[PDB]
Design a protein around this ligand. Structure first.
Ligand SMILES: [Mg+2]
Ligand SMILES: [Mg+2]
Ligand SMILES: [Mg+2]
Ligand SMILES: [Mg+2]
Length: 127
RNA sequence: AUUUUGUUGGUUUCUAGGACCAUCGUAAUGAUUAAUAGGGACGGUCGGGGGUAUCAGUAUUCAGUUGUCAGAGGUGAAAUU
C-alpha cells in the first residue's frame, strides 16, 4: 500500500524532536526540533513549536516519497523523567492532520533495570 | 588400754571394745513428676537470613561504523558549555 518511514519522536521537557527515518533507522529523511521554530529558550519544548516542527517534517517527507509513518515516542528516560514532554502529543497530532498516514504507535522510552545513580544528590534539587 | 596377778618396768597370750573384710539370711531391697521451663534428636517444610562461585537484564558514559543538517543542552528565566 503506502510507503512507511518511522517517526522517532523524542519529547523531553526542554525540547521536542521530530525525526523520521526509514524502517531501519540508518537513513534520516527529516529532523526538525522545536528549537528551530522559536527564538526563546523557554518554549523550545512547547506544543506550538512541536506542531510547527511536524509540519516542516511532514512537508519535507512528501517530496521524498514518505506517505505514511510509524511512531516511536520516547521521553528522556534513563535516570531522568520517563514522562513525555509537552511537545510529543502535538507533533503527533500535527502529523495525522498533515496528510501523513499513521501505522503502529509505541513508547520506546529507555527504562533501566534499576540503573546508575541519578544526579541531584541525596536531598534533591532544593528550590 | 579398763581391769588384777603384794609391787615397778612386767610380758604375750589371754581375756573385752571399737574398725574393716567375707559368707549367709532378712526386704515390696533402692532411681518422684516430665513444667503450655528449658536443652537435644527426628519430619516435611519456609524465608529478599549468611558465605562462595555463577548467569541475566536494560540503563549510564565512552568509542566505532552509518545517516542527514543547525542548532543542542539547561532553567522559573538565562548564562557558562
Ligand atoms: Mg520549597
Ligand atoms: Mg516437658
Ligand atoms: Mg505442604
Ligand atoms: Mg562473590
Amino acid at each position: 500500500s503506502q510507503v512507511f518511514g518511522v517517526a522517532r519522536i523524542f519529547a523531553s521537557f526542554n525540547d521536542t524532536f521530530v525525526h523520521v527515518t526509514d524502517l531501519s533507522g540508518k537513513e534520516t529523511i527529516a529532523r526538525v526540533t522545536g528549537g528551530m521554530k522559536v527564538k526563546a529558550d523557554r518554549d523550545e519544548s512547547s506544543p506550538y513549536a512541536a506542531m510547527l516542527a511536524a509540519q516542516d517534517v511532514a512537508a519535507k517527507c512528501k517530496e521524498v516519497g514518505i506517505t505514511a509513518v510509524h511512531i516511536k515516542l520516547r521521553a528522556t528516560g534513563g535516570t531522568k523523567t520517563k514522562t513525555p514532554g509537552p511537545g510529543g502529543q502535538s507533533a503527533l497530532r500535527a502529523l495525522a492532520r498533515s496528510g501523513l498516514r499513521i501505522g503502529r504507535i509505541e513508547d520506546v522510552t529507555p527504562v533501566p533495570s534499576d540503573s546508575t545513580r541519578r544526579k541531584g544528590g541525596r536531598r534533591g534539587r532544593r528550590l
